[PDB]
């Protein structure tokens, strides 16, 4: 182990996710539960919309709804910022610009509460078009595999990332979601600032046949790569 935080991820860890959202004034909430295992890079989560119908497509919230569960290979352990911030945790902030449509602004705290890894999120969505791909629910219930590049932010004592997500549209087009991300430690403790690398992601979206509430079952594998050795 090369951080104190890394010791908290040697096994399966239960997860709680809480989002409070407002998109074009439509207020909604989501809660998720499941578990993460950073030893194999695997997350399993089930999310419900606690307020009724989700006013945005579930795929648009996948990135917002725990990168501490990324599998960092043995040779890359000194580049794992996310676990190094634990248990105090980190703030994850994004701007998500939907091409030709509105913007999500997010702020999340990811930290241990008890033995649970908690991701608690506020989301504000602005300038969405009523007849767009988002408020119109024109996005396919699926999710493309993606590489996300991680850089150190020495000033903020954390990391930053920009990346584009490609959401398939029912009419065969693609809706781009341009992500700008920064992560900053909550705690005063020392953290690992990484060399340039990327995270390889794969997300499978499904439904619980016994679940009548508006919901998303998520299986996510995230693996770090891109460092030649060390």
UniProtKB/Swiss-Prot annotation:
Family annotation (Pfam families): GFP (PF01353)
Consequence the record notes for mutating residue 143 to A: In Cerulean; leads to improved quantum yield, a higher extinction coefficient and is 2.5-fold brighter than ECFP
Gene Ontology terms: biological process: bioluminescence; generation of precursor metabolites and energy
Keyword Membrane applies: no
Effect in UniProt of substituting residue 201 to Y: Gives rise to yellow-emission variants. In EYFP; leads to yellow fluorescence, folds faster and more efficiently at 37 degrees Celsius and has superior solubility and brightness
Keyword list, A-Z: Chromophore, Luminescence, Photoprotein
Effect of residue 200 to F: In H9; increases fluorescence at 395 nm excitation
Applications reported: Green fluorescent protein has been engineered to produce a vast number of variously colored mutants, fusion proteins, and biosensors. Further generation of mutants led to more stable proteins (at 37 degrees Celsius for example) with brighter fluorescence and longer fluorescence lifetimes.
Record annotation: effect of changing residue 191 to A: In mut1.5; shifts fluorescence lifetime from 3.03 to 2.72 ns
Phenotype upon changing residue 143 to H: In mut1.3; shifts fluorescence lifetime from 3.03 to 2.78 ns. In mut1.5; shifts fluorescence lifetime from 3.03 to 2.72 ns. In mut1.27; shifts fluorescence lifetime from 3.03 to 2.85 ns
PTM note: Contains a chromophore consisting of modified amino acid residues. Maturation of the chromophore requires nothing other than molecular oxygen.
Primary role: Energy-transfer acceptor. Its role is to transduce the blue chemiluminescence of the protein aequorin into green fluorescent light by energy transfer. Fluoresces in vivo upon receiving energy from the Ca(2+)-activated photoprotein aequorin.
Similarity comment: family membership: Belongs to the GFP family.
Protein name (database record): Green fluorescent protein
Organism: Aequorea victoria (Water jellyfish)
């Amino acid at each position: 182990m090369v951080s104190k935080g890394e010791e908290l991820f040697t096994g399966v860890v239960p997860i709680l996710v809480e989002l409070d959202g407002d998109v074009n004034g439509h207020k909604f909430s989501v809660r998720g539960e499941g578990e993460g295992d950073a030893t194999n890079g695997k997350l399993t989560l089930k999310f419900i919309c606690t307020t009724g119908k989700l006013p945005v497509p579930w795929p648009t919230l996948v990135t917002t709804l725990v990168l501490c569960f990324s599998r960092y290979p043995d040779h890359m352990k000194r580049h794992d910022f996310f676990k190094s911030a634990m248990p105090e945790g980190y703030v994850q902030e994004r701007t998500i610009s939907f091409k030709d449509d509105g913007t999500y602004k997010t702020r999340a705290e990811v930290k241990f509460e008890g033995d649970t890894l908690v991701n608690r999120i506020e989301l504000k969505g602005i300038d969405f078009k009523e007849d767009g791909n988002i408020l119109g629910h024109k996005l396919e219930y699926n999710y493309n595999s993606h590489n996300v590049y991680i850089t150190a932010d020495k000033q903020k004592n954390g990391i930053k990332s920009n990346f584009k997500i490609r959401h398939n549209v029912e009419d065969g087009s693609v809706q781009l979601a341009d992500h700008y991300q920064q992560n900053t430690p909550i705690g005063d403790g020392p953290v690992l600032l990484p060399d340039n690398h990327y995270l390889s992601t794969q997300s499978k979206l499904s439904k619980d046949p016994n679940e009548k509430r508006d919901h998303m079952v998520l299986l996510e594998f995230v693996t770090a790569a891109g460092i030649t050795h060390g």
